[PDB]
Amino acid sequence: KKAVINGEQIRSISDLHQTLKKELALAEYYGENLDALWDALTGWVEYPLVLEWRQFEQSKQLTENGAESVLQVFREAKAEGADITIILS
Numbered sequence: 001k002k003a004v005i006n007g008e009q010i011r012s013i014s015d016l017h018q019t020l021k022k023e024l025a026l027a028e029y030y031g032e033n034l035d036a037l038w039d040a041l042t043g044w045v046e047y048p049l050v051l052e053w054r055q056f057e058q059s060k061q062l063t064e065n066g067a068e069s070v071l072q073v074f075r076e077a078k079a080e081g082a083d084i085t086i087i088l089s
Contacts, residue, residue: 003023005051006055
């Protein structure tokens, strides 16, 4: 229902995936890559979903903009109709 990312604590793309793994209660063998993220959104996660992403710009610098691609996956599921709310602090 509610997943939180403290971007200040992010140090890489995998950190993001593993945080997401914990915050969204993803599958034990979740793949930690952009494709696994799409698959978990379409066939694992329960909606309504609120994803609060704090200090987004900081996580952006610390992942060589990788956070932007992870964010695109959520926006894509949203464009396709998924009930997701993203809060970018």
